[PDB]
């Protein structure tokens, strides 16, 4: 019932902003402005099927994805909101596991869930559980990361292996026989991103969820009016993900990630940035993958250095991967 | 494609924050701090069935509800996020109508939709359309509205008639035979609330959505450690809503409102506050309904001044009223 669900929310997420709260949380603005001059603000909804998977669950994901959307601006995520849409009859055991994981993930990341909402719909009106989170943090005045700034000669990096999350979910949903080898990379990336905070050569940073790295590179190119060239052989792809690629013929560049950055840097900063990423556990597999060029468009270099236009796909590999 | 949906979003909601955006909106903190010392931050999900109804729709509702949750703090709402969950095959005519109403409601209220998300699920996995919005605004330093401040002697008012929204949806969903008599009160309340901004004796404001006025007075009582006594005869209830009460035996105090305030005021300010409310189109039916008292608990005064404990109901009158 509604009262048990509300009690679960309040107990699990309990903090000084949520307690004694009325219709809204009330956040100290002086504290935020002391951290930075801009407030980063993002929202995402989470409709992943299944709810639980190797490496995470919808609840952990709902904190990670939104914390990362904030964190890639250079801001430390501090406050999140949470809206649950529940299907009547969802086992309490399942809801409790999701909420427990959300609360733990937020607690570990130093994030407070300061406000929320729960709606219950009848059986069949929603598939089990959907979550929306919105988040905020203050962007330090000296950090100016954006793709509009990119110019010919800039280097493109990824913080780790590509397509782990997408491949994990595809394997589960389509029963591809790789259970035990694939794991989601779902993680809060703030500690990794903060290694880059004082490095002058860092120019743009984005996480690569829906649409994977392919979407990001196309977004980067559209923003700066320059082209981007990616080396296919330079792409770090785990053996189990390669296995999914082989079976389905689908691109690891198109697979959603839930713990990876695409980073654009000044040419002379590339080795310094790689070293910073390699020093942190979340950046251990970071690699150079490409370059910003004068010639517009996105190209992938295959065999014998042949550069071919890299198209965006028409749809995601499968519905509800995130 | 769902790039049709993303195009609808960007076109309808277009503003400087949404354009050339990467993973997050970026909001000027100095401007917020100059307005107030606290940031009000709220979120609500909207799962109303049906999507369109007399007096509004899910889109207008998604703006109103979240704007109101911010505005009851004293803050002027400035920025909203918007997360859509869409069922595959939802007619574009429906979605366009929803988005248009959202855009027009936001524009009229001077609210910018600065960031968002869309997720699409398969047929049967969600009932047509769900929306989450989160919103923010700065609370002026000199406004200290809070339920915790209430003391014995304070007067309770409502800003209009009770249960119009809930009753409208109940009549539609349960086919009670009152079509054309009932209309939802869905409205952005900021202009009404701002009549009270400079009135010294205003102590607490809440909107009265889920659980209605009954939930608000219970929340007030819990926050301040004082009791609340309500006059049953003083409750303003329209004839058609009374008709729903008569048919179902259900209480207008429990029915959801989507354009009503419950206001607590210093005893001496009651006449001034009532006149201020009556001066605005949205507060014409405002009324005194009770008082805060020393004896703890919530009581309803019936025939012959008999005061009886007013219990909260176990469930909402029906799922998906909001």
XYZ file of C-alpha atoms in Angstrom:
644
model
C 0.000 0.000 0.000
C 0.898 3.689 -0.450
C 1.816 4.248 3.219
C 4.343 1.375 3.329
C 6.012 2.593 0.130
C 6.297 6.163 1.436
C 7.705 4.823 4.715
C 10.318 2.797 2.808
C 11.378 5.917 0.846
C 11.712 8.106 3.959
C 13.612 5.496 5.997
C 16.019 4.486 3.208
C 16.863 7.990 1.929
C 16.647 9.749 5.331
C 18.650 12.986 5.439
C 18.288 16.511 6.919
C 16.765 17.938 3.680
C 14.154 15.196 3.311
C 13.140 15.100 7.006
C 10.564 17.670 8.214
C 10.291 18.704 4.546
C 7.050 20.148 3.155
C 6.294 20.286 -0.614
C 9.898 21.039 -1.591
C 13.494 20.628 -0.423
C 15.330 23.817 0.577
C 19.006 23.986 -0.374
C 21.654 26.462 0.869
C 22.447 28.698 -2.128
C 25.490 30.395 -0.542
C 27.191 26.983 -0.255
C 26.587 26.257 -3.944
C 27.782 29.669 -5.192
C 30.948 29.243 -3.074
C 31.662 26.062 -5.074
C 30.966 27.525 -8.511
C 29.165 30.082 -10.651
C 26.897 27.738 -12.621
C 24.485 25.081 -11.380
C 24.606 21.859 -13.388
C 21.112 20.373 -13.620
C 20.075 17.170 -15.394
C 17.316 14.569 -15.460
C 16.958 11.021 -16.779
C 14.335 8.291 -16.591
C 15.225 4.643 -16.148
C 13.180 1.889 -17.768
C 15.772 -0.915 -17.932
C 14.598 -4.529 -18.342
C 15.538 -6.594 -16.422
C 15.584 -4.691 -13.114
C 18.606 -6.678 -11.886
C 21.658 -7.661 -13.962
C 25.343 -8.505 -13.445
C 27.059 -5.352 -12.199
C 23.936 -3.498 -11.050
C 20.216 -2.784 -10.991
C 17.708 -0.063 -11.905
C 18.225 1.661 -8.533
C 22.016 1.830 -8.690
C 21.660 2.889 -12.344
C 19.232 5.716 -11.465
C 21.838 7.270 -9.141
C 24.874 6.594 -11.397
C 23.422 7.918 -14.666
C 22.155 11.168 -13.211
C 25.180 11.734 -10.968
C 27.362 11.311 -14.105
C 25.281 13.734 -16.207
C 25.998 16.341 -13.524
C 29.623 15.276 -12.898
C 30.806 15.506 -16.541
C 30.335 19.294 -16.297
C 33.077 19.371 -13.625
C 30.492 19.789 -10.823
C 30.396 17.589 -7.729
C 26.854 16.139 -7.608
C 25.275 16.966 -4.234
C 21.485 16.774 -4.447
C 19.165 14.402 -6.305
C 15.393 14.057 -6.670
C 13.654 10.720 -7.243
C 10.291 9.806 -8.786
C 9.109 6.197 -8.679
C 6.391 4.743 -10.907
C 5.381 1.353 -9.435
C 3.159 -1.395 -10.807
C 0.588 -2.599 -8.281
C 1.660 -6.033 -7.057
C 5.425 -5.569 -7.446
C 6.917 -7.753 -4.692
C 7.981 -5.668 -1.701
C 11.218 -7.687 -1.629
C 12.117 -6.391 -5.107
C 11.237 -2.777 -4.281
C 13.267 -2.969 -1.050
C 16.331 -4.322 -2.892
C 16.120 -1.491 -5.459
C 15.667 1.208 -2.807
C 18.464 -0.246 -0.640
C 20.864 -0.169 -3.610
C 19.845 3.409 -4.540
C 20.376 4.592 -0.985
C 23.756 2.848 -0.696
C 24.947 4.176 -4.076
C 23.950 7.746 -3.155
C 25.511 7.432 0.328
C 28.829 6.187 -1.103
C 28.855 9.073 -3.624
C 28.170 11.752 -0.988
C 24.809 12.485 -2.634
C 21.593 13.344 -0.758
C 18.172 12.402 -2.132
C 16.413 15.537 -0.936
C 12.967 15.181 -2.474
C 10.823 12.559 -4.150
C 7.514 11.130 -5.265
C 5.939 7.704 -5.671
C 3.050 6.816 -7.983
C 1.397 3.395 -8.136
C -0.387 2.272 -11.315
C -2.563 -0.828 -11.782
C -1.298 -4.221 -12.967
C -0.374 -3.940 -16.656
C -0.201 -0.108 -16.712
C 3.567 -0.220 -16.083
C 6.161 -2.973 -16.378
C 7.150 -3.361 -12.707
C 9.172 -0.228 -11.870
C 10.308 3.004 -13.604
C 12.513 5.671 -11.969
C 13.216 9.305 -12.769
C 16.044 11.145 -11.074
C 17.068 14.776 -11.458
C 20.329 16.085 -10.053
C 22.438 19.144 -9.409
C 25.898 20.397 -8.462
C 27.903 23.612 -8.815
C 30.430 23.885 -11.647
C 33.750 25.430 -10.535
C 34.261 28.839 -12.156
C 37.553 27.766 -13.786
C 36.162 24.649 -15.500
C 34.885 25.248 -19.028
C 34.286 21.876 -20.665
C 32.180 21.853 -23.840
C 32.309 20.426 -27.370
C 31.847 23.864 -28.996
C 35.499 24.502 -28.104
C 36.964 21.623 -30.148
C 39.334 22.371 -33.041
C 41.368 20.411 -35.623
C 44.191 18.448 -33.983
C 42.375 17.749 -30.693
C 42.637 14.151 -29.466
C 39.772 11.827 -28.499
C 40.011 9.410 -25.594
C 37.716 6.921 -23.900
C 38.089 6.183 -20.167
C 37.727 2.407 -20.627
C 36.313 -0.523 -22.590
C 33.281 0.020 -24.802
C 29.825 -1.541 -24.768
C 29.979 -3.529 -21.521
C 26.553 -2.455 -20.254
C 24.743 -2.749 -23.587
C 26.322 -6.148 -24.264
C 25.403 -7.443 -20.779
C 21.737 -6.532 -21.258
C 21.600 -7.886 -24.837
C 23.029 -11.198 -23.622
C 20.430 -11.440 -20.837
C 17.437 -10.379 -22.931
C 18.300 -12.341 -26.089
C 19.800 -15.329 -24.218
C 23.073 -15.337 -26.157
C 24.898 -17.904 -23.981
C 27.504 -15.605 -22.410
C 26.188 -15.598 -18.815
C 29.100 -15.270 -16.385
C 31.429 -13.374 -18.744
C 29.573 -10.057 -19.148
C 29.194 -7.399 -16.446
C 27.705 -3.884 -16.506
C 30.124 -1.025 -15.858
C 27.504 0.935 -13.888
C 29.475 3.381 -11.713
C 29.506 6.898 -10.350
C 32.330 8.634 -12.239
C 32.867 11.746 -10.079
C 36.118 10.473 -8.507
C 37.542 9.699 -11.974
C 36.414 13.060 -13.406
C 37.943 15.001 -10.513
C 41.400 13.630 -11.506
C 40.976 15.830 -14.608
C 39.752 18.960 -12.788
C 43.059 20.892 -12.767
C 44.371 19.736 -16.187
C 44.259 22.729 -18.609
C 44.195 20.620 -21.806
C 40.836 18.958 -21.101
C 38.287 20.493 -23.492
C 35.134 18.322 -23.534
C 33.686 15.437 -21.524
C 30.536 13.394 -21.960
C 29.231 10.088 -20.690
C 28.110 7.653 -23.381
C 24.817 6.039 -22.407
C 22.031 5.915 -25.034
C 23.613 5.787 -28.509
C 27.014 4.868 -27.036
C 30.269 6.418 -28.206
C 28.868 6.812 -31.771
C 26.205 9.290 -30.570
C 28.809 11.246 -28.579
C 31.321 11.602 -31.451
C 28.496 12.826 -33.736
C 27.383 15.312 -31.044
C 31.016 16.519 -30.713
C 31.340 17.005 -34.496
C 28.005 18.852 -34.803
C 28.981 21.187 -31.940
C 32.441 22.288 -33.127
C 31.892 22.260 -36.909
C 34.900 19.972 -37.387
C 35.167 16.314 -38.331
C 36.156 13.384 -36.171
C 38.174 10.344 -37.199
C 38.102 7.174 -35.093
C 40.495 4.228 -35.380
C 38.609 0.898 -35.288
C 41.672 -1.075 -34.156
C 42.295 1.415 -31.295
C 38.870 0.720 -29.734
C 39.141 -1.106 -26.388
C 36.524 -3.886 -26.442
C 36.442 -6.781 -23.930
C 36.487 -10.346 -25.384
C 32.935 -11.076 -24.167
C 31.654 -7.869 -25.832
C 33.468 -8.865 -29.062
C 31.543 -12.156 -28.713
C 28.227 -10.285 -28.672
C 29.376 -8.183 -31.650
C 30.207 -11.386 -33.561
C 26.839 -13.003 -32.805
C 24.642 -9.996 -33.567
C 26.758 -8.030 -36.085
C 26.123 -4.918 -33.979
C 28.685 -2.208 -33.150
C 30.277 -1.772 -29.691
C 30.357 1.947 -30.618
C 26.525 1.823 -30.510
C 26.212 -0.109 -27.208
C 25.227 1.904 -24.123
C 27.838 2.456 -21.422
C 27.020 3.229 -17.784
C 30.533 3.952 -16.512
C 32.540 5.443 -19.398
C 33.664 8.905 -20.520
C 34.463 10.189 -23.980
C 37.076 12.915 -23.553
C 38.439 15.498 -25.988
C 41.831 17.013 -25.144
C 44.487 19.359 -26.583
C 47.042 17.264 -28.519
C 49.854 18.109 -26.073
C 47.749 17.061 -23.055
C 46.816 13.560 -24.289
C 49.556 11.650 -22.446
C 49.009 13.642 -19.223
C 45.255 12.893 -19.320
C 45.844 9.175 -20.026
C 48.231 8.974 -17.056
C 45.633 10.621 -14.779
C 42.948 8.171 -15.923
C 45.265 5.142 -15.638
C 46.096 5.993 -12.010
C 42.426 5.573 -11.006
C 40.658 2.179 -10.969
C 37.753 3.547 -13.094
C 40.184 4.722 -15.801
C 42.495 1.685 -15.978
C 41.582 0.807 -19.595
C 41.582 4.381 -20.945
C 42.771 4.660 -24.572
C 43.354 7.124 -27.418
C 40.772 6.368 -30.110
C 40.722 9.289 -32.548
C 41.282 12.876 -33.585
C 39.381 16.048 -34.485
C 40.095 17.012 -38.119
C 39.290 19.927 -40.458
C 37.252 17.773 -42.850
C 33.668 17.666 -41.546
C 31.817 14.437 -40.764
C 32.474 11.343 -38.679
C 34.677 8.588 -40.103
C 35.914 5.204 -38.901
C 39.330 4.005 -40.093
C 39.275 0.301 -40.956
C 41.815 -1.929 -42.691
C 44.733 -0.261 -44.533
C 43.853 3.137 -43.033
C 40.670 3.432 -45.104
C 38.472 6.164 -43.601
C 34.759 5.534 -44.085
C 31.732 7.552 -43.004
C 30.362 6.221 -39.713
C 26.560 6.407 -39.723
C 24.328 6.662 -36.671
C 21.946 3.687 -36.393
C 18.182 4.117 -36.835
C 17.299 2.667 -33.397
C 18.985 1.323 -30.253
C 20.058 -2.361 -30.370
C 16.993 -3.184 -28.245
C 14.353 -1.261 -26.247
C 14.929 -0.596 -22.531
C 18.688 -1.130 -22.220
C 18.787 1.882 -19.840
C 12.363 6.935 -34.986
C 12.163 8.710 -31.635
C 14.170 11.596 -33.094
C 10.676 12.793 -34.042
C 9.977 12.993 -30.299
C 13.298 14.732 -29.527
C 12.538 17.238 -32.314
C 9.119 17.965 -30.786
C 10.773 18.573 -27.386
C 13.505 20.927 -28.656
C 11.095 22.863 -30.907
C 8.239 23.308 -28.411
C 10.343 24.061 -25.309
C 13.092 26.064 -27.089
C 15.140 28.372 -24.829
C 18.816 29.461 -24.354
C 19.482 26.702 -21.767
C 18.087 23.883 -23.890
C 19.954 24.905 -27.081
C 23.522 23.610 -27.617
C 23.087 21.659 -24.374
C 25.211 18.597 -23.660
C 24.446 16.244 -20.696
C 23.050 18.930 -18.348
C 21.582 22.430 -18.203
C 23.851 25.125 -16.751
C 22.115 27.783 -14.668
C 23.466 31.110 -13.413
C 23.934 30.830 -9.631
C 24.600 34.545 -9.022
C 21.144 35.390 -10.391
C 19.505 32.820 -8.062
C 21.491 33.972 -4.991
C 20.409 37.562 -5.754
C 16.761 36.439 -5.548
C 17.107 34.473 -2.314
C 19.218 32.475 0.116
C 17.532 29.061 -0.362
C 16.842 27.032 -3.475
C 13.395 25.379 -3.441
C 13.556 22.067 -5.311
C 10.636 19.711 -5.964
C 9.727 16.748 -8.154
C 6.448 14.995 -9.020
C 5.451 12.222 -11.437
C 2.186 12.354 -13.366
C 0.286 9.186 -14.255
C -3.250 10.581 -14.618
C -5.888 8.568 -16.481
C -7.385 9.876 -18.744
C -4.701 12.095 -20.329
C -7.216 14.816 -21.191
C -10.092 15.872 -18.922
C -12.394 18.837 -18.239
C -10.137 21.671 -17.080
C -6.776 20.320 -18.235
C -4.475 17.533 -19.348
C -1.391 15.586 -18.171
C 0.916 18.199 -19.779
C -0.564 21.307 -18.149
C -0.775 19.269 -14.927
C 2.941 18.315 -15.055
C 3.879 22.014 -15.161
C 1.262 23.177 -12.618
C 1.921 20.547 -9.947
C 5.680 21.047 -9.865
C 5.504 24.842 -10.242
C 3.110 24.891 -7.281
C 5.326 22.696 -5.085
C 8.112 25.273 -5.645
C 5.861 28.354 -5.385
C 4.344 27.463 -1.984
C 7.796 28.122 -0.447
C 7.634 31.784 -1.518
C 10.016 31.154 -4.438
C 9.165 32.212 -7.967
C 9.592 29.054 -10.083
C 12.160 29.635 -12.851
C 13.470 26.299 -14.149
C 11.919 22.880 -14.785
C 13.226 19.550 -16.055
C 10.932 17.174 -17.953
C 11.179 13.375 -18.282
C 8.813 11.509 -20.612
C 8.005 7.797 -20.551
C 6.114 6.948 -23.742
C 4.333 3.790 -24.897
C 5.363 2.776 -28.429
C 2.510 3.586 -30.822
C 1.192 6.594 -28.897
C -0.475 8.782 -31.541
C 1.717 11.784 -32.393
C -1.472 13.880 -32.325
C -1.839 13.066 -28.614
C 1.830 13.734 -27.782
C 1.868 16.994 -29.770
C -1.210 18.222 -27.864
C 0.409 17.301 -24.520
C 3.700 19.017 -25.407
C 1.940 22.153 -26.754
C -0.019 22.543 -23.502
C 3.157 22.059 -21.431
C 4.958 24.685 -23.499
C 2.130 27.239 -23.281
C 1.610 26.691 -19.523
C 5.368 27.101 -18.881
C 5.640 30.170 -21.147
C 2.663 31.907 -19.495
C 4.172 31.215 -16.055
C 7.616 32.485 -17.147
C 9.141 29.057 -16.539
C 11.897 27.632 -18.744
C 12.072 23.900 -19.421
C 15.870 23.688 -19.362
C 16.545 19.968 -19.642
C 14.807 16.676 -20.236
C 14.673 13.070 -21.313
C 12.484 10.699 -23.275
C 12.233 6.932 -22.868
C 10.077 4.744 -25.103
C 8.798 1.366 -23.921
C 6.943 -1.314 -25.925
C 3.152 -1.591 -26.265
C 1.709 -2.789 -22.946
C 4.774 -1.805 -20.882
C 3.315 1.624 -19.993
C -0.181 3.080 -20.301
C 0.315 5.698 -23.061
C 2.298 8.468 -21.330
C 3.858 9.232 -17.918
C 5.682 12.503 -17.098
C 8.130 13.484 -14.375
C 9.023 17.120 -13.783
C 11.420 18.666 -11.298
C 11.541 22.391 -10.613
C 13.393 25.090 -8.752
C 13.354 28.723 -7.704
C 15.039 30.895 -5.063
C 13.174 31.656 -1.810
C 13.463 35.343 -0.786
C 15.552 35.703 2.387
C 12.724 37.474 4.252
C 10.094 34.746 3.590
C 9.981 32.087 6.310
C 6.949 29.936 5.575
C 6.963 26.571 7.329
C 4.501 24.254 9.066
C 6.894 23.929 12.013
C 6.261 27.590 12.957
C 2.536 27.101 13.745
C 1.265 27.752 17.271
C -2.051 27.618 19.156
C -4.400 30.344 17.910
C -3.256 30.397 14.269
C -6.029 30.346 11.633
C -6.354 27.887 8.724
C -7.724 28.892 5.319
C -8.175 27.174 1.978
C -7.804 29.213 -1.224
C -10.902 27.739 -2.905
C -13.439 24.917 -3.108
C -12.282 21.402 -2.200
C -12.094 18.271 -4.301
C -12.937 19.615 -7.776
C -10.073 17.796 -9.473
C -10.506 14.437 -7.701
C -14.285 14.538 -8.191
C -13.908 15.406 -11.903
C -11.654 12.372 -12.475
C -13.835 10.107 -10.283
C -16.923 11.093 -12.316
C -15.075 10.394 -15.589
C -13.536 7.082 -14.511
C -16.515 5.679 -12.591
C -19.145 7.211 -14.931
C -21.243 8.753 -12.148
C -23.518 10.786 -14.458
C -22.305 14.339 -13.807
C -20.487 15.233 -17.069
C -20.410 18.974 -17.804
C -20.857 19.959 -14.142
C -17.344 19.164 -12.869
C -14.071 20.806 -13.966
C -10.487 20.293 -12.704
C -8.904 23.305 -10.949
C -5.456 22.635 -12.474
C -3.558 25.981 -12.420
C -0.165 27.562 -11.713
C -0.662 29.267 -8.337
C 2.374 31.587 -8.312
C 0.293 34.725 -9.103
C -2.150 33.907 -6.257
C 0.683 33.085 -3.832
C 2.428 36.371 -4.620
C -0.612 38.292 -3.217
C 0.560 36.912 0.147
C 4.295 37.539 -0.270
C 4.301 40.833 1.616
C 1.599 39.999 4.190
C 3.389 39.698 7.576
C 1.143 37.116 9.296
C 1.332 34.323 6.698
C 3.031 31.373 8.424
C 2.753 28.255 6.245
C 1.509 27.259 2.790
C 1.012 23.894 1.161
C -0.775 22.715 -1.931
C -3.309 19.961 -1.398
C -2.761 17.271 -4.034
C -2.488 13.573 -2.976
C -4.475 12.982 0.216
C -6.117 16.414 -0.129
C -6.650 18.887 2.717
C -6.866 15.989 5.191
C -3.213 15.048 4.486
C -2.066 18.694 4.752
C -3.668 19.325 8.162
C -2.206 16.061 9.486
C 1.223 17.146 8.178
C 0.769 20.596 9.768
C -0.224 19.039 13.115
C 2.809 16.682 13.086
C 5.243 19.476 12.152
C 4.237 21.916 14.902
C 3.226 19.608 17.779
C -0.159 21.327 18.045
C -3.651 20.080 17.195
C -5.896 21.296 14.387
C -9.693 21.696 14.526
C -11.717 22.133 11.315
C -15.336 23.291 10.936
C -17.204 20.821 8.725
C -19.877 23.360 7.712
C -17.205 25.952 6.782
C -15.610 23.657 4.146
C -16.303 25.155 0.698
C -17.553 22.357 -1.587
C -19.279 22.916 -4.971
C -22.744 21.310 -5.516
C -21.432 18.772 -8.096
C -18.602 17.639 -5.773
C -21.180 17.254 -2.976
C -23.015 15.010 -5.463
C -19.928 12.760 -5.773
C -19.626 12.659 -1.953
C -23.311 11.656 -1.716
C -22.916 8.865 -4.289
C -19.683 7.375 -2.956
C -19.695 8.375 0.747
C -16.150 9.725 0.196
C -14.788 12.910 1.743
C -13.926 16.073 -0.245
C -11.167 16.553 2.402
C -9.482 13.501 0.884
C -10.011 14.380 -2.815
C -6.948 15.634 -4.704
C -6.751 19.322 -5.657
C -4.585 20.661 -8.472
C -5.105 24.383 -7.889
C -5.720 24.885 -4.150
C -3.723 26.144 -1.162
C -4.014 25.481 2.530
C -2.710 28.538 4.384
C -1.932 28.972 8.062
C -1.840 32.542 9.377
C -1.471 34.561 12.583
C -4.955 35.064 14.021
C -4.888 38.842 13.462
C -3.962 38.450 9.769
C -6.913 36.252 8.766
C -9.165 39.053 7.421
C -6.329 40.683 5.440
C -5.276 37.329 3.941
C -8.859 36.392 2.996
C -9.378 39.766 1.263
C -6.065 39.390 -0.610
C -7.095 35.918 -1.832
C -10.578 37.122 -2.836
C -8.922 39.853 -4.929
C -7.379 37.314 -7.326
C -9.271 35.184 -9.914
C -7.781 31.990 -8.408
C -8.752 32.801 -4.783
C -12.388 33.929 -5.210
C -13.756 30.991 -3.155
C -11.162 31.232 -0.355
C -12.462 30.541 3.171
C -11.503 30.187 6.801
C -11.918 26.545 7.799
C -10.261 26.049 11.174
C -7.644 26.839 13.794
C -4.503 25.477 15.459
C -5.091 24.506 19.102
C -3.018 23.261 22.076
C -4.613 19.803 22.307
C -2.762 17.563 19.848
C -4.515 15.675 17.048
C -6.754 16.587 14.118
C -10.492 16.967 14.797
C -13.531 17.779 12.664
C -16.369 19.765 14.272
C -19.797 18.456 13.208
C -23.344 18.964 14.480
C -23.707 20.803 17.813
C -19.980 21.615 17.841
C -19.052 17.970 18.443
C -15.327 17.570 17.705
C -14.319 14.122 16.446
C -10.899 12.796 15.486
C -10.432 13.046 11.735
C -8.615 9.929 10.510
C -6.589 9.609 7.325
C -8.032 7.098 4.833
C -6.177 3.852 4.045
C -5.968 4.459 0.267
C -6.559 7.111 -2.401
C -10.194 7.125 -3.682
C -8.971 5.588 -6.985
C -5.581 5.051 -8.694
C -4.133 7.595 -11.152
C -6.116 10.690 -10.173
C -2.837 12.690 -10.578
